[PDB]
Design a protein around this nucleic acid. Structure first.
Length: 268
RNA sequence: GUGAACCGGAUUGCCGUCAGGAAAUUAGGUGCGCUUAGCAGUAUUCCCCACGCUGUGGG
């Protein structure tokens, strides 16, 4: 079975007061870490019932869950929705017990058993990371002059199109190229949002040796994280019920640890 | 093992009954925070592993 969970954030109100929930969404790494803190081990929960001990990733279960962040929901109020799809039951009352300021509504969870027959029309929403891997010559310095270096870099960069092609056509072709393998066939696809997603990651770096021995003194260095994001919505038709269920709960692209793979399907 | 050694200033006691700081006070007169900007139609996306001469998988 699948577990589907929904979280709500205000992202509104008085701008002259602290808003930890709205500020929490400025870094995708922080969002991923906070969502990962919702799956504690059976020993950590017994030892620390209040989540008041130092946080170590080795004490939390590893499981490839997926999530997406949606915005602009109305009713005279602003809302940001976080939708999480997982293969395990989340523990929201352990993750947000000391951070109830973050949310504007209690978390909700439910079961999900999608059974689809062959040749069924579905309405889908999903966000992609438009990335391709290429060999790039290394240009450096640019101190008024460009100096080339002989090394060729294997780098994952953004998807590009020609001057006579619209981004929508390029993305539709790029998705229809792989849609045979995933297990569905498109009928219409339109691009809604195209942009970037940013984040920062801490990394330990050694500085000096310990006089008493047994380790170093260490410090933190921050590494940037940039991704190309494109949101799509449209209609699809199931080819075979076997590969489609594998496409779900797995992702349809890269950067799946930063909310970049999730298929949302409605029966039309 | 020294004008040194042995060596208690000790026993008893309430400072209690008395007291209005009180009559009177406007802190008022004058003042633009103003000149400025796509979260988007791109030409390298920070790191690692495997298969090829771009496609999978992890942060």
């Amino acid at each position: 079975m699948i577990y589907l969970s929904r979280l709500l954030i205000d992202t509104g109100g008085n701008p002259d007061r602290p808003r930890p929930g709205r500020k929490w969404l400025d870094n995708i790494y922080n969002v991923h870490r906070r969502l990962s803190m919702a799956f504690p081990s059976g020993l950590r929960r017994e030892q620390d019932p209040h989540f008041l001990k130092p946080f170590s990733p080795n004490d939390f279960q590893k499981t490839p869950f997926l999530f997406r962040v949606d915005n602009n929901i109305d009713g005279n109020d602003k809302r940001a929705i976080i939708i999480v799809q997982s293969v395990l039951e989340p523990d929201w009352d352990y993750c947000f017990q000391n951070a109830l300021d973050f949310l504007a509504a209690p978390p909700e969870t439910k079961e999900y058993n999608p059974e689809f027959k062959a040749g069924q029309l579905l309405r889908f929403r999903l966000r992609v990371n438009a990335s391709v891997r290429r060999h790039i010559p290394e240009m450096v310095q640019q101190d008024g002059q460009t100096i080339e270096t002989g090394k060729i870099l294997h780098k994952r960069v953004s998807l590009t199109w020609d001057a006579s092609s619209t981004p929508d056509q390029a993305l539709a072709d790029w998705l229809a190229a792989k849609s045979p393998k995933l297990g569905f066939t498109l009928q219409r696809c339109e691009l809604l949002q195209l942009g970037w997603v940013y984040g920062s990651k801490p990394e330990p770096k050694n500085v000096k040796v310990k006089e008493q021995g047994q380790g170093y003194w260490r410090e933190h260095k921050y590494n940037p994280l940039r991704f190309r994001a494109a949101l799509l919505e449209g209609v699809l038709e199931v080819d075979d019920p076997k590969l489609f269920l594998k496409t779900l709960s797995s992702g349809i692209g890269k950067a799946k640890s930063f909310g970049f793979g999730l298929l949302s399907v409605l029966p039309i």
